[PDB]
Amino acid sequence: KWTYFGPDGENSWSKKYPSCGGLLQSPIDLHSDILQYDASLTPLEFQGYNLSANKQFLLTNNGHSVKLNLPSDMHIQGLQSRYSATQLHLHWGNPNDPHGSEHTVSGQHFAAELHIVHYNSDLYPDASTASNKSEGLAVLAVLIEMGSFNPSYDKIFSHLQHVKYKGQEAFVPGFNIEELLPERTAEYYRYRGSLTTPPCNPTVLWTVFRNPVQISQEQLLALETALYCTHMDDPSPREMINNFRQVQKFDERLVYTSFSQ
Amino acid sequence: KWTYFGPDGENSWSKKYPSCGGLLQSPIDLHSDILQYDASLTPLEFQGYNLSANKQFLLTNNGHSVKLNLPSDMHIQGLQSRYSATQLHLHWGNPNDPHGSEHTVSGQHFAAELHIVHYNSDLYPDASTASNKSEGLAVLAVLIEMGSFNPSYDKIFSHLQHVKYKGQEAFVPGFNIEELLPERTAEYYRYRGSLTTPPCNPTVLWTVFRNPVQISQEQLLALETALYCTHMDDPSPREMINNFRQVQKFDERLVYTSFSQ
Numbered sequence: 001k002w003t004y005f006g007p008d009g010e011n012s013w014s015k016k017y018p019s020c021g022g023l024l025q026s027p028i029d030l031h032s033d034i035l036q037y038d039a040s041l042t043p044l045e046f047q048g049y050n051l052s053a054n055k056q057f058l059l060t061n062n063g064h065s066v067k068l069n070l071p072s073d074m075h076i077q078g079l080q081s082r083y084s085a086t087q088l089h090l091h092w093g094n095p096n097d098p099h100g101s102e103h104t105v106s107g108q109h110f111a112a113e114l115h116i117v118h119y120n121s122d123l124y125p126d127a128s129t130a131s132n133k134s135e136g137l138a139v140l141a142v143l144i145e146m147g148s149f150n151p152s153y154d155k156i157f158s159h160l161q162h163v164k165y166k167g168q169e170a171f172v173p174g175f176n177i178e179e180l181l182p183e184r185t186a187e188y189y190r191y192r193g194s195l196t197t198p199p200c201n202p203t204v205l206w207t208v209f210r211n212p213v214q215i216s217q218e219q220l221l222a223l224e225t226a227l228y229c230t231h232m233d234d235p236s237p238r239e240m241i242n243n244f245r246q247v248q249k250f251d252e253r254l255v256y257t258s259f260s261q
Numbered sequence: 262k263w264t265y266f267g268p269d270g271e272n273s274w275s276k277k278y279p280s281c282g283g284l285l286q287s288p289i290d291l292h293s294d295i296l297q298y299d300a301s302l303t304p305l306e307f308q309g310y311n312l313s314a315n316k317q318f319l320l321t322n323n324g325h326s327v328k329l330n331l332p333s334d335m336h337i338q339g340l341q342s343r344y345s346a347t348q349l350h351l352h353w354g355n356p357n358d359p360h361g362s363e364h365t366v367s368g369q370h371f372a373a374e375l376h377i378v379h380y381n382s383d384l385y386p387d388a389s390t391a392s393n394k395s396e397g398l399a400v401l402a403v404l405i406e407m408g409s410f411n412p413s414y415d416k417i418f419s420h421l422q423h424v425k426y427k428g429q430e431a432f433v434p435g436f437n438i439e440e441l442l443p444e445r446t447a448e449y450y451r452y453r454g455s456l457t458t459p460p461c462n463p464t465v466l467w468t469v470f471r472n473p474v475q476i477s478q479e480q481l482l483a484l485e486t487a488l489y490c491t492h493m494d495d496p497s498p499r500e501m502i503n504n505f506r507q508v509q510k511f512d513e514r515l516v517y518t519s520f521s522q
């Protein structure tokens with residue numbers, strides 16, 4: 001299958017996933033020349049993010065990232081349709097170059113990036129059906145930098161020990177996913193783009209929050225060193241690192257901002 | 262018929278040109294995490310760069326860039342073989358976004374980039390042979406920023422309305438090519454990489470000078486509006502703009518610097 005390195009890496013995804021060589025590809029560099037304040041971009045409302053402490057949510061190593069399944073009563077309010085959550089996951093670099101966000105800001109990577117994936121549940125029955133359809137998906141992106149310890153991110157990272165290898169699964173008790181969001185969620189970048197992984201469908205409404213979150217140096221190192229892409233029994237193990245796509249060309253287009261200041 | 266934009270752009274190159282999806286791809290972002298000083302990287306000497314003004318050298322629009330043919334008596338001294346020149350060419354952006362270098366430094370693009378292409382003439386009889394052999398080619402890269410008018414670059418640019426279309430050829434009087442190089446050529450980045458266009462062979466020893474040169478806004482605009490990828494009779498003309506590849510992953514690779522600091 002597809003990978004982020006070697007022969008099956010991102011320059012080859014378009015052979016078997018043609019949309020990876022098509023229009024509206026993500027991620028992109030967010031830089032001042034292409035930003036345009038749009039007073040119409042009002043705050044999102046995060047509904048059902050306070051997950052029941054009494055419910056468990058499936059965490060998976062899928063060989064590409066670590067993903068947490070989310071329930072479809074969790075949703076964003078504010079967009080043209082209701083977009084219901086389906087999963088969250090992360091992208092990161094490696095300890096020798098700990099700059100593995102997908103989006104960049106003025107050419108600079110952040111340490112990592114969290115994506116909370118939602119689908120248009122007013123139009124489609126599930127995310128897998130929505131993903132290749134018009135208006136199918138909305139992703140929230142949180143940029144992550146090393147700083148202070150983050151107890152909320154640790155509600156996910158304390159389980160990394162149990163999803164070390166591809167295919168492994170663990171259960172995470174519900175917690176308030178809004179705790180993973182940064183300060184001043186009113187401030188964000190917005191643009192139409194794509195999945196950043198195969199099949200790269202150009203069906204994502206992106207919201208990248210302006211302000212990053214922090215996690216400690218030990219948390220970032222844990223994220224970068226805890227997982228493998230490969231199955232446990234693989235005689236040639238591969239660490240799960242550098243699981244981000246390079247930025248894409250983005251020309252004659254704008255990213256709209258909810259902030260002018 | 263590869264291009265820099267649209268269906269046949271760079272995410273699709275690897276469909277026809279397998280090395281574009283292979284190892285050792287160029288260009289790259291030059292940033293601190295991947296740099297290491299190497300005291301062995303001693304100064305290059307540029308020999309036979311002062312081309313006779315009474316001779317002329319062929320300028321050709323090859324559908325992807327503009328190239329100036331260079332004589333094989335022009336060479337670099339200081340590498341492990343003699344590398345003789347074959348051609349130079351440029352990469353650039355567009356009038357509304359004059360940010361088209363290939364290499365970036367700490368996430369920033371420069372306005373344009375000059376490549377002076379050499380081949381190992383000790384080992385091979387011509388650059389096309391050398392180009393499919395490891396370390397067969399050595400390319401010098403000069404980063405170009407918007408700044409003062411540059412008379413020396415204008416010795417090339419003044420001939421562009423004469424090679425606007427694919428297949429057209431002009432003659433440029435000899436001049437001193439060293440005038441295209443920046444200050445303190447002793448300061449450079451060195452790494453093993455590839456051609457930045459199809460067929461992307463991983464056969465280039467790159468030298469990117471630390472210091473940029475300047476050309477004016479007017480020179481950039483001329484460059485960015487002069488040229489077409491297509492023939493003069495093509496009913497579907499395409500402007501030669503934005504002819505730079507995105508930066509490539511470079512992990513496990515290190516870039517060696519002839520400067521500490």
Ligand SMILES: CCCSc1c(F)c(F)c(S(N)(=O)=O)c(F)c1F
Nearest residue numbers: 115117127128131139194195196197
């Ligand atoms: C079918 C529903 C989830 S698949 C998926 C995905 F894996 C992503 F990485 C992304 S990403 N990285 O673009 O957020 C995504 F948007 C997705 F939709």
Ligand SMILES: CCCSc1c(F)c(F)c(S(N)(=O)=O)c(F)c1F
Nearest residue numbers: 376378388389392456457458459460
């Ligand atoms: C002998 C090789 C002919 S094709 C070629 C080239 F000459 C370059 F200089 C480059 S560059 N841009 O790497 O200098 C390139 F990409 C090419 F594909």
Ligand SMILES: [Zn+2]
Nearest residue numbers: 089091115196
């Ligand atoms: Zn993602």
Ligand SMILES: [Zn+2]
Nearest residue numbers: 350352376457
């Ligand atoms: Zn070039």
